[PDB]
């Protein structure tokens, strides 16, 4: 079981039933964040003070305090061409579509 | 290595004071001051052993 | 049951921090815990990535794991402590108390 | 009242379009129904807009 890390996550819009409104792209690489969050956190990644304290408490007693969680801490956009609710054709940059870094929070 | 039992509290102290959060190395020496007698035993928990 | 903010009392002596923190001796930090499943409530201010991952997890939980409940807003507290040089310092520490939780 | 098997796809579609996010305490109450279409009946509970 690895420490918190960015990992593959392929998104297929047709698989998700979004081919009836998304024209392009039909797939993209989104990534996801998963893995152990335990003392020591990767300190060069600047975890929040809260997460440092919570990780210390979870190391003190993992039966009393739960661990922090591996999540996206930076994300980036992709552009999508799609048909909106009103049948306009739209090319739009969707924010926060792709994980760029993971971290324990 | 990094003894979690020996190091977790003192390393956490240094982290929340915003020390030991660089990499090889500017902040190297204020991190060492903060870990104090535990530098040898714990420098690996923050990757500063040089 | 869903992602929410729960109590978490921090006692500095219990963690070994009494030798350097003078005051306060303890504070309420809170923590974030609970399920992140479809539908993510828009009060969880979810990112687009989380909505997508949540939909994928809902469709095939064996292939895609759920998003996770974490702090999304935090507030500070002030601490009076002794630093490594033996100065006494009163300082606001950021990101110490959970104000809101959300699936990310 | 929220059929997660029936509703997850189209409800998520509307969310990432930043629809069905205004609280009824209402602005988007209608642009949400437009996005859900025939599934407004079967999926309004998924966002409580009913
Ligand atoms: Ca569809
Ligand atoms: Ca020593
Ligand atoms: Ca101590
Ligand atoms: Ca219908």
Residue numbers in the entry:
A (entry chain A): 397 to 501
B (entry chain D): 25 to 48, 53 to 78
C (entry chain B): 398 to 501
D (entry chain C): 25 to 49, 53 to 77
The authors write:
Twisted gastrulation (TWSG1) is an evolutionarily conserved secreted glycoprotein which controls signaling by Bone Morphogenetic Proteins (BMPs). TWSG1 binds BMPs and their antagonist Chordin to control BMP signaling during embryonic development, kidney regeneration and cancer. TWSG1 is composed of two distinct, disulfide-rich domains. The TWSG1 N-terminal domain occupies the BMP type 1 receptor binding site on BMPs, whereas the C-terminal domain binds to a Chordin family member.
To understand how TWSG1 interacts with BMP ligands, we determined the crystal structure of the TWSG1 NTD in complex with GDF5 at 1.96 Å resolution. The disulfide-linked GDF5 dimer binds to two TWSG1 NTD molecules that are related by a non-crystallographic pseudo two-fold axis (RMSD of 0.419 Å for 138 equivalent Cα atoms of the 1:1 TWSG1 NTD:GDF5 complexes). The two TWSG1 NTD molecules in the complex adopt a similar conformation compared to the apo TWSG1 NTD (0.33 Å for 38 equivalent Cα atoms), with the major variability observed in the loop connecting helices α1 and α2. The TWSG1 NTD binds to the finger region of GDF5 and interacts with both protomers of the GDF5 dimer. The TWSG1–GDF5 interface centers around helix α1 of TWSG1 sequestered between the two finger-like motifs and helix α3 of GDF5. The side chain of TWSG1 Ile40, at the core of this interface, inserts into the hydrophobic pocket of GDF5 formed by Trp414, Trp417, Val448, Ile449, Phe478, and Tyr490, and is shielded by a salt bridge between TWSG1 Glu42 and GDF5 Lys488. TWSG1–GDF5 interactions are mediated by two salt bridges (TWSG1 Lys28-GDF5 Glu434 and TWSG1 Glu42-GDF5 Lys488), 4 hydrogen bonds, and 72 hydrophobic contacts involving 20 residues from TWSG1 and 18 residues from GDF5. Unexpectedly, the structure of the TWSG1–GDF5 complex reveals a previously unknown calcium-binding site at the edge of TWSG1–GDF5 interface. In our TWSG1–GDF5 complex, the TWSG1 NTD occupies the BMPR1-binding site on GDF5. We identified the TWSG1 NTD as the high-affinity BMP-binding domain, enabling us to determine its structure in complex with a dimeric BMP ligand. This structure revealed that TWSG1 NTD binds to the same site on BMP as BMPR1, suggesting that TWSG1 inhibits BMP signaling by competing with BMPR1 binding.
